[PDB]
Ligand binder design. Structure first.
Ligand code: 27M
Ligand code: 27M
Lengths: 9, 238, 237, 9
C-alpha cells in the first residue's frame, strides 16, 4: 500500500 | 521519549511538526461540479502526503509498529484534514479556507451534489471554534489526539495500546497546562477541556459523512482520485 | 433554569432515577436464527427502547426547557448512540458478548448471521472491553449518556448557551464524582479526557450502525416501525 | 411526526 511506503520513506 | 517530555516541550514539538498551508492550482478567472471537486481532491491528496510526514513527528507515533501507524492514519485521515480546514477558516465567518487562494463561501458548496450539507457542518464547527476562541496551541493538541485516539479501540500487543493511552494522557496534561497558563480556574480548565474534546465527536461525524460523499464521487467518475486517495477511501470499506 | 441550580449530587440522583429499564426481546428459541429473524429481534427491541428513551430524555435536567423542535432534533441525532452506549454498558460483565436483552445475549459468531453486522458487533465489543479496562462506574455512565443527548445535535443548530451551560454542569458533576472517588487532581482531568474520547468512538459506531440499518431497510430484510423509520430518515442516508 | 407527538404524552 502507498501509505506503508510513505511511512517508510 | 514522548513520555519524558514536559508540557512545554510537547507544545514545541507539535508546533514544530506542523505542516505547511498549501495553495490550490485554482484559476480564479474561470466553477463547475467536476471543476470544484477536482480542486478539492487534488488539494486533499497533497495535504495527505504532508500529513504522513507530520504524523511521524507526533511524539510517540514512531514507537508504534508500521501496522499500527497505518491503521491510525487510515482511520483518522479525513478527521485530521477537516479539523485543519476548520482551523484555517476560523477567522473567516461563513467561509471555508481550503487554501489561501481557495476561500469558498457556504453557497459555493451547492456546486457539488451533497456538498452543502458537509460545508454547513464544517462552518458550524469553525463558528464553535470562534465562540470558544480556540488557540493555536490547543489546536495542535486536539489534532494529535485525533491521530492517536480514533483508531485506538479497534486494535500480545496491548502494551502498544497502553503506551498510546499514556501518550494521550500526556497530551491531556499539555492541554491543561496551556489553560492554567492562560489563567483559567480549575473549574474552568475542566469545563474547557470537556468542551474541546466534545468537538471531536462532531469532527468524527463530519468525517463519516465526508467519507460517504467522497465515495459517491468515486462511483460517479466525475473526478479522478489519486491512487493514494483511493487507498485511504477503501480502508473505510463503505 | 432549575437544572443550573442543581448540586452535583442532585444531578447524579436525577439521572440515576431517570434510568430506563432493561427490556426483553421476543426471541423465540423454537426456531433457528435467520438473517431476517435476528435483525427483526433487534429492530423490535430498538423500537421499544426508543419509547423509554423518549421519556428518559424528558427527565434529563434542562431538556424540557428546550422547544419541541429542539428536543426532536437532539433525539433524532443521538438516538442510536444512546442505544449503543446502553448496550455496551449492559454488556460490561459479559466479555465477548453483547447483552441486547436478558434473553438475548449474542457473540460475534452469531452476529455474522446478519450481513455487515459482525463489523458493528466487533466495535461494540471493543468499547465494552474499554469500559471494563477503565472500570467505568454507573454514575459516570449516566453522565456520559446525558452528554451524548445534549451534545450530538447541538452544532446542527440563546438556547445554544443554555445547552452548553447544562453540559458544563455535567462536567462539574463528573469531576465531583472522580474527586469523591479519591482520584488525584491529575487523574481527574486524565480520566475526564479518557471518558469523553469514548464518545468519539460511540459516534463512529452510530454512523456505521445507521448505514447498516439503512441497508437492511433498502433490502427489505425486516419491516421497521413507523417511529424507527422516522428516526432513520432524519439521518438522510 | 411520531416523535413530536410522543414527546408530549
Ligand atoms: O473536507 C474535505 C476536504 C477536502 C480537501 C482538503 O484539503 C481538506 C478537506 O477537509 C472534503 C474532501 C472531499 C469530500 O468529498 C468531502 C470533504 O468534506
Ligand atoms: O446496536 C443496535 C441496537 C439495536 C437495538 C437495540 O435495542 C440496541 C442497539 O444498540 C443496532 C441496531 C440496528 C442495526 O442495524 C445495528 C445495530 O448495531
Amino acid at each position: 500500500k502507498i501509505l506503508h511506503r510513505l511511512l517508510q520513506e | 521519549l514522548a513520555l519524558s517530555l514536559t508540557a512545554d516541550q510537547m507544545v514545541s514539538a507539535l508546533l514544530d511538526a506542523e505542516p505547511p498551508i498549501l495553495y490550490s492550482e485554482y484559476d480564479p478567472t474561470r466553477f463547475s461540479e467536476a471543476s470544484m471537486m477536482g480542486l478539492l481532491t487534488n488539494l486533499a491528496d497533497r495535504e495527505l502526503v504532508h500529513m504522513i510526514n507530520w504524523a511521524k513527528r507526533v511524539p510517540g507515533f514512531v514507537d508504534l509498529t508500521l501496522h499500527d501507524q497505518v491503521h491510525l492514519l487510515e482511520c483518522a485521515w479525513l478527521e485530521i484534514l477537516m479539523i485543519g480546514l476548520v482551523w484555517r477558516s476560523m477567522e473567516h465567518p461563513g467561509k471555508l479556507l481550503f487554501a489561501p487562494n481557495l476561500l469558498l463561501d457556504r453557497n459555493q458548496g451547492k456546486c457539488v451534489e451533497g456538498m452543502v450539507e458537509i460545508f454547513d457542518m464544517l462552518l458550524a464547527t469553525s463558528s464553535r471554534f470562534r465562540m470558544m476562541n480556540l488557540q493555536g496551541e490547543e489546536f495542535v493538541c486536539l489534532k494529535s489526539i485525533i491521530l492517536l485516539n480514533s483508531g485506538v479501540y479497534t486494535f500480545k500487543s496491548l502494551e502498544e495500546k497502553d503506551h498510546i493511552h499514556r501518550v494521550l494522557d500526556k497530551i491531556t496534561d499539555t492541554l491543561i497546562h496551556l489553560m492554567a497558563k492562560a489563567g483559567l480556574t480549575l473549574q474552568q480548565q475542566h469545563q474547557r477541556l470537556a468542551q474541546l474534546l466534545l468537538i471531536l465527536s462532531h469532527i468524527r461525524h463530519m468525517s463519516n459523512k465526508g467519507m460517504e460523499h467522497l465515495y459517491s464521487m468515486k462511483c460517479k467518475n466525475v473526478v479522478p482520485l489519486s491512487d493514494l486517495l483511493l487507498e485511504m477511501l477503501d480502508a473505510h470499506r463503505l
